[PDB]
Every structure is written in C-alpha cells, then in structure tokens.
Amino acid sequence: AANHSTTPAILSQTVLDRFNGALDPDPNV
Amino acid sequence: YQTKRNVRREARTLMGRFKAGKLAPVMAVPVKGSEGGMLSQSVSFELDPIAGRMATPITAEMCAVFVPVQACDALKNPEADYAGMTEIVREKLLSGNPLFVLEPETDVSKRCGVNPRSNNGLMRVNEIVRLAHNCAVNFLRRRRYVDAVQLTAANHSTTPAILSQTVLDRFNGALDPDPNV
Amino acid sequence: DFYNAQKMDELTRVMRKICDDNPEYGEEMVLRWAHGLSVDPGRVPFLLAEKSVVLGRQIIGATDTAGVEDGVKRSDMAAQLSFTVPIPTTELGGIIVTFACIKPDETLSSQPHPILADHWRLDNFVADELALDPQPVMARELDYKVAQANETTVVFYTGLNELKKTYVSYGLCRALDPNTVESKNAVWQLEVPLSVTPETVLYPADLPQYPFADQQAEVCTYVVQSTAVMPTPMIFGPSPVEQLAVIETEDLFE
Amino acid sequence: KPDETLSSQPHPILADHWRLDNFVADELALDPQPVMARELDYKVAQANETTVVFYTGLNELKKTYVSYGLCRALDPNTVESKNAVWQLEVPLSVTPETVLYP
Amino acid sequence: SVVLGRQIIGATDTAGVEDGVKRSDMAAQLSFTVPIPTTELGGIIVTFACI
Amino acid sequence: DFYNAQKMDELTRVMRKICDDNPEYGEEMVLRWAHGLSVDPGRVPFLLAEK
Numbered sequence: 001a002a003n004h005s006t007t008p009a010i011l012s013q014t015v016l017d018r019f020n021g022a023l024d025p026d027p028n029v
Numbered sequence: 030y031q032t033k034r035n036v037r038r039e040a041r042t043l044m045g046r047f048k049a050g051k052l053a054p055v056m057a058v059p060v061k062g063s064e065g066g067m068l069s070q071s072v073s074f075e076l077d078p079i080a081g082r083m084a085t086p087i088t089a090e091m092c093a094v095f096v097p098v099q100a101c102d103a104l105k106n107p108e109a110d111y112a113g114m115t116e117i118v119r120e121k122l123l124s125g126n127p128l129f130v131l132e133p134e135t136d137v138s139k140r141c142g143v144n145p146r147s148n149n150g151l152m153r154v155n156e157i158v159r160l161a162h163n164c165a166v167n168f169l170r171r172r173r174y175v176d177a178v179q180l181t182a183a184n185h186s187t188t189p190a191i192l193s194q195t196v197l198d199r200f201n202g203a204l205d206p207d208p209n210v
Numbered sequence: 211d212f213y214n215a216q217k218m219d220e221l222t223r224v225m226r227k228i229c230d231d232n233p234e235y236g237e238e239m240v241l242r243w244a245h246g247l248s249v250d251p252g253r254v255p256f257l258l259a260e261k262s263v264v265l266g267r268q269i270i271g272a273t274d275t276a277g278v279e280d281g282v283k284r285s286d287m288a289a290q291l292s293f294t295v296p297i298p299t300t301e302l303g304g305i306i307v308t309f310a311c312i313k314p315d316e317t318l319s320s321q322p323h324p325i326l327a328d329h330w331r332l333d334n335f336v337a338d339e340l341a342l343d344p345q346p347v348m349a350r351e352l353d354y355k356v357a358q359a360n361e362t363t364v365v366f367y368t369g370l371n372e373l374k375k376t377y378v379s380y381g382l383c384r385a386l387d388p389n390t391v392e393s394k395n396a397v398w399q400l401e402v403p404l405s406v407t408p409e410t411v412l413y414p415a416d417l418p419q420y421p422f423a424d425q426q427a428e429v430c431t432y433v434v435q436s437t438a439v440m441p442t443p444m445i446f447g448p449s450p451v452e453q454l455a456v457i458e459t460e461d462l463f464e
Numbered sequence: 465k466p467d468e469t470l471s472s473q474p475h476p477i478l479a480d481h482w483r484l485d486n487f488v489a490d491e492l493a494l495d496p497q498p499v500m501a502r503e504l505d506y507k508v509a510q511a512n513e514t515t516v517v518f519y520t521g522l523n524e525l526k527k528t529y530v531s532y533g534l535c536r537a538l539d540p541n542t543v544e545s546k547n548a549v550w551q552l553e554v555p556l557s558v559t560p561e562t563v564l565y566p
Numbered sequence: 567s568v569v570l571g572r573q574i575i576g577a578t579d580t581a582g583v584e585d586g587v588k589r590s591d592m593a594a595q596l597s598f599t600v601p602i603p604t605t606e607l608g609g610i611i612v613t614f615a616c617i
Numbered sequence: 618d619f620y621n622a623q624k625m626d627e628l629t630r631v632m633r634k635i636c637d638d639n640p641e642y643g644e645e646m647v648l649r650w651a652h653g654l655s656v657d658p659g660r661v662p663f664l665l666a667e668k
Contacts, residue, residue, distance in 0.1 A: 122302075
C-alpha cells in the first residue's frame, strides 16, 4: 500500500506454464 | 514401436530478403523416422519500388524437396564405399556415435530458419541442414540436365536459380551425336 | 548385319529414354537394366510440391506539380504461394527443404532472323530429302554478340533447318536509345552470353537488377508461414507437479 | 501489449545431435528430468548454460514449437518501411516464473 | 485507324490548385488478323504505324 | 519402482515372443525393434512345402 504509480502488464502465459514445467517437483508422486 | 501413438506440432513464421535470380532456401522442416502427417507452408512476395511501368512478367516459384538421411551420408562420406546404403547408416546409428554432429552457423542454416545452440558461447547447428540443401540443389539441377555441375558438401551460401529451358533443349540439339543412329 | 543394326539402333534409343526419363541414375541404371538388375530406391531424393505464379502490378502516380508534368509513377509487385502435401514416412527420416526464387523473363533478344539475316536462295527439296544426318549449327546463328574467333566454332551438332520451326524474340528496337524510356523501363530479361557453354542449367553468378535503384540490394522481402502436424512414436512422458509448502511443514500426513 | 511469441529458441531436433532413441528405455522414465538453460534461447551467458531453469518433462520441448522472428541473415537496419516487428524480447532462462512485464 | 483517347490528371499541391496544372495522356490499341497470300516466289510483309 | 517393474517384466515377455516367433533373427531383431528399425528381408531363406 505504498504504490503510487502504474504497473507493468501481466503476461498471457509464463515460460513455466508454456512448457508445462515446475520449479521443484515432489518425491511422493 | 514404429507406429503412430502421439503427435508433434511446429509453427515457424519467418521474414527476410533474398536476391532475385538466386535459389534462396527459406525453411527446413525436420522429419524423423516413422513419422508422417500434413505439411502446410506459405510464402509472401514483396519487391522494392520500381520506377515507371513494368510489362515484362516476373515469375516467383515455390519448391519443396525431401532429402533422405541416406543421401546426406554420401556427401559427408563420398570416398567411402557403400556410404549411403541403408544398412550402413542403420548400423552406425546403433553404435551410439551420432550420425550428424553440430557445425557453426552458415547462410544456408541462417536462411533455413533454424535457431542456433550456444555451445560454450559459440553458435552451433547440425550439419544435416547444409548437406540436405546441397543435395536438393543438385536434384533440381539434374532434372534439367543430368550432366550438370554438382555441388559438394562444402557449400555454405545460396545458389543461382535454374533455367526453365536450356539453349540445347530449346533448339532440340545435342553436343555429340551417335554414328549408329 | 542390318538386323543387329536396326535393332541396336532401336535398342539404343530405349537406353537414351531411361537416363533422361529417370534422372539422377544416368550411366548406372541402364547398365543394370541391360543385365536385369535394379538399384536401391530409398537413397534418392524426390520432389513434394512445385508452385509458380506471375507477380501482379499496381501503379501509383504522383500528384505534385513536378510529378504531373514529368509523369512520375511507381510499380508494386506482390504474390502469394502456398501448398499442402503429405509427409512421406520413412524408417530413417529425412529433411524437407523449401525454396523461393524470383526470376526475370526467360526470352531471347539477340538472335538473327533465320531468313532475313541470310542470303535469299532457292532450296533443293529433292536434295534435302536425302539428308538424315546431324548437320552443324555454328555460332553466329544464335546471337549477334559473338567474337571474331567464335563465329566458326560449332555450338551444337543437330537439326536440318531446326532454326526455323519456332522463332521467339522480346527486346527493344535497335534504333531506340536505352537511355530513354526510364519511366517505361519494362525491360528485365536474362542477357545470357549464349554460344559459349550451350548446356547450362545455372544462372549467372551476378544478375543485376536494372529496374531497381540498387543492383546489389535484395529486392524481395519474403514472409514464411509453416505449420506441421507429425504423428510420432515418441513417449512424451508425464508432467510433474509443484510442491506444497503446507505439506512437510504442518505435517498433514503425519 | 505487443505480440507474445518467442523468437530466440533453438530447434529441438536440428540444433542437437541426430541420435537414435531407445524407446524401451524411454518407457521406463516417469521421473522429472532436468531442462537446463541453453534449451530455451541462444541468448545465454557462459555460466548460465549449465544452470537448471525448470525440472520437468520427458521430451516436453518437442510437443509444440512456435517461433516468430526475422531471419538471422537479414539486417534489421533494413525493412524500416516494413517494420512489422513488435514482440517481447524477454531475457528468458533467468526467472522462468514471472507474471510481470519488464 | 483510331483516334487516341484522353485522360486528365490534375495537380493537387497548392501551386497546382491555384494555377490549375493538369496532364493529358493519350493511348490506343490496334490489331488485325489477315491471311497471308500464297505465291510461288514469296514476298515481304511490311507493317507501318504513323501518328 | 513397481511401475518400471510390471512394465519391464511385461515388456520383456514381448521381446521373448519375437525371437521365437521370428527365428533366424534372434538377439538382433529385438535390438532393432526397440530402437524402431528393421532388418534386410531378402537374405533369409523360407520354407515352400512340408509333407
């Protein structure tokens, strides 16, 4: 709540989602 | 295992300029073993402004050539005997050593649209594209005249176009007639 | 004899029809054909598609005072080409290479008229009937741009009056000065040297762009668009999942 | 916003060695494989090539390939009257998870 | 024979509008198809185009 | 594990069924089969009749 200016837009599809990836997978699955 | 179960998809859009009178490659779509489907390509044309009026027609052609891996091996190993046979390449694949290895970027590779690979900071591309282009160029040349100049596997630039009708064919001639006929 | 001949002559023409009708196998398939053998089929390349079109033209004229007086105008050329063909399945695969070439008009401009450029003489039809041998076709019969020494040289050795079956020409009048008609410069055709190297399927290494301001500039500007769907047997294994901080932190599974 | 389409990405097949896949071995592969940098774009520093961007997928870089950019042979100084180029040249590789424009 | 047509192109710049500058373009097309007269010794067919 | 197994076990039996169902190619056709290749067909003999 200190922002007092416009903000950059938001990507339609991130790199991670584009390739259907993950930063840290789980061992159980 | 050589049966279709899954599918791939490619969508490459490219832009560039190529000089007239030159057989300029535009794209190179790779096809691996036991693969098939539909291919759809489209190319636009737009020339620089021309002063005055043009009445002599200008022809633009679009061509597609399929170059098997067997043919590409012959150019890489021309002196070797049986170099391009299916069994030889089939056996060499089983060895483990890659049949084709990366090479530095060239005009043919750059114009074909293949983006390079940063191997220790140096751009790299597989040798198959360059070999395929040279073989495809020779194939087109042989159609007009079998005893045409052949390009080796050292070509790294575009090639001049091919005439629609040679002088000898235009007059229905021959360089050396036969005595028996 | 005259039976081995009249058979070897006929059999020879069959051999000739195989090298040209089946290119990229010349002097090798005929040998195997005679002995009753075949060649390996899968090594050879083959063509998938071949599209051609003639560029359209649109004229835009200047409206300013200078343009109206002089008559300034521009020519714009564009075209569209696309094809859809199936990919040929192979055990070892292959590479599909596409090409896009722009060429000028392939029409001759320097060639003497077969009749009006030679003496007017009366033909001996009876003698011409007894002529079934390859006659010479010396240079200076194809173009007037021939050096002194090259006139006598034989370009190709064929034909009886073959230079009169069809005559095609497209060029400016010799009286006209090319320095003019710079606003009607409708001239773009291949001025091949001719005579020398009659057999050549290759364009000259340097083809100037006369109608364009810059000859060394790449006139065209091509935009490609390819979409490919390729069924393949690759596994395309699974998609992992991210880790939830709540698990392993608050011990939901204990 | 401009067009969100990649332009710097090596071809999965033509930018790597031509090797014969072991389908039987690939069947026994249900674990997250690494996807190191230099597989997403060629604008990668020397040190960043070995770094792992995301840890997922078995041949996931071949299901779909999309590219839109100028030919590397062409000089961008030209086509200033056909300048139809406006797309996001994100650095990529670094910070793969980012919902924010530069 | 034919009479050339005319098309008028007018200037739009300020000087052209004030003065009234314009251009006249003239063009025409002519063609014929006739049989060639057969003769024992032949002849020469000469064409002319005069304005 | 127990998924790679229960798959390798099942996949192994498929390999076994090829060497015996396709003799005179044992330990060579299965290798090419896994990689997605084939053998030269014309070298092999074959039976014509059996009485």
